[PDB]
Amino acid sequence: MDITRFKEDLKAHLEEKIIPFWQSLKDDEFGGYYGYMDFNLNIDRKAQKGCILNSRILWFFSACYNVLKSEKCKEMAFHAFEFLKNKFWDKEYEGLFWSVSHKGVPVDVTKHVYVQAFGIYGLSEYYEASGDEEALHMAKRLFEILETKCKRENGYTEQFERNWQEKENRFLSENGVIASKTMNTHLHVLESYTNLYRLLKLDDVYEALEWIVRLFVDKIYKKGTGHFKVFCDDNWNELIKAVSYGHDIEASWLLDQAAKYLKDEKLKEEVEKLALEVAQITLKEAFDGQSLINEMIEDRIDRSKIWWVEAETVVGFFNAYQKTKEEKYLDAAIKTWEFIKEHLVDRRKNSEWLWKVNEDLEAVNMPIVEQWKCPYHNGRMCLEIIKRV
Ligand SMILES: OC[C@H]1O[C@@H](O[C@@H]2[C@@H](CO)O[C@](O)(CO)[C@H]2O)[C@H](O)[C@@H](O)[C@@H]1O
Numbered sequence: 001m002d003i004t005r006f007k008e009d010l011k012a013h014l015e016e017k018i019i020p021f022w023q024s025l026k027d028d029e030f031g032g033y034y035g036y037m038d039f040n041l042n043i044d045r046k047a048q049k050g051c052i053l054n055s056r057i058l059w060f061f062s063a064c065y066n067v068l069k070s071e072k073c074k075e076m077a078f079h080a081f082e083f084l085k086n087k088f089w090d091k092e093y094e095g096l097f098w099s100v101s102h103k104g105v106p107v108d109v110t111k112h113v114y115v116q117a118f119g120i121y122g123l124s125e126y127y128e129a130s131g132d133e134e135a136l137h138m139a140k141r142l143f144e145i146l147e148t149k150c151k152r153e154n155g156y157t158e159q160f161e162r163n164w165q166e167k168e169n170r171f172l173s174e175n176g177v178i179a180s181k182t183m184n185t186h187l188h189v190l191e192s193y194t195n196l197y198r199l200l201k202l203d204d205v206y207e208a209l210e211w212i213v214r215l216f217v218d219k220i221y222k223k224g225t226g227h228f229k230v231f232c233d234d235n236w237n238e239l240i241k242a243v244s245y246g247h248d249i250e251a252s253w254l255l256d257q258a259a260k261y262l263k264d265e266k267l268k269e270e271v272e273k274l275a276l277e278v279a280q281i282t283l284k285e286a287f288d289g290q291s292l293i294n295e296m297i298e299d300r301i302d303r304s305k306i307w308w309v310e311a312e313t314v315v316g317f318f319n320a321y322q323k324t325k326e327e328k329y330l331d332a333a334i335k336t337w338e339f340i341k342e343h344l345v346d347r348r349k350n351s352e353w354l355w356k357v358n359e360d361l362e363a364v365n366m367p368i369v370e371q372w373k374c375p376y377h378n379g380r381m382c383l384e385i386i387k388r389v
């Protein structure tokens, strides 16, 4: 359990494997980054380009500069910022499109809160890296749009048409239920507002950060279970029995992050207690001694090992270790990284990470790059460990 060795292995992995892979996807002919790479490492240069992917690339290279001081990474972030500003930002109705073509032609023009949140997250990180206030101004405008067009008493309406007329929340629902409230969307609003507030100390941003933290404590968390509600209606009634172990452990450390900034000391204590309760129950129920399982939908336990779940497990257990100094969390975090190294890091040349292996540890055919597989979960796992003192 050598933490210095752990950190230097993560830094070496980030610099030798993850950063060069994502740099190789830069699209200098059309802007942005290539949108898709299949299981066999074939890039589709003409694939549509997802906005979540672009914003996660923007966040990643900006954070690489902020932590490692790599000027080349800052340039790669600039490239992602330009494509966001020029192609993903809707000149007619504002906010970010869901996807554009390889040329930047709008393809899916619907406006989802999840996409706007990742815009805020990446733009605020880019402001820190570049000093370019326009990025912070765009982040603040996305914040204003979420608060004034998308927010209601019980949280955010999650999906809209291009012109901000409400729509059914299908892109963020799963398991055959159309959920109008998802923990997933609300968690990434919380994440983006934490990063925004960290860099922009405005009362309106603070109050919205406290508000979404309170929603997690009072409505989304199921007290004493270590579990968050997953897919709900607008009253946060669960539409299906479901537990997402990866979202639980990601929420644990993201809630602790936000708690740093709370001025309500009672709330802060409740949040820190809740975050540890989630970490403890997740370790007990989902960690098998090498890695974390995925989710339970109704009675079906998915024991596949998903790349982003294991990444968030390393961060979430390392955070629980830092808070408690209980060695069990440190051991679980390092063991999960060893699992990743052995089973999810791609051994082919000039590759990255695999999407998943099944319970039997066999790789399943899945893309390496797409709208939902980016450098954010795995890059952040490295950057977060490196950052912490
Ligand atoms: O159901 C939405 C979408 O969720 C994807 O898993 C995502 C992941 C994307 O890398 O990032 C989270 O938001 C973590 O906070 C997860 O919810 C899933 O891969 C994708 O299939 C699904 O459509």
Ligand SMILES: [Cl-]
Pocket: 030, 031, 032, 082, 083, 086, 087
């Ligand atoms: Cl561009």
Ligand SMILES: [Cl-]
Pocket: 256, 271, 272, 273, 275, 276, 323
């Ligand atoms: Cl805590």
Ligand SMILES: [Cl-]
Pocket: 056, 308, 372, 373, 374, 375, 376, 377, 378
């Ligand atoms: Cl990602």
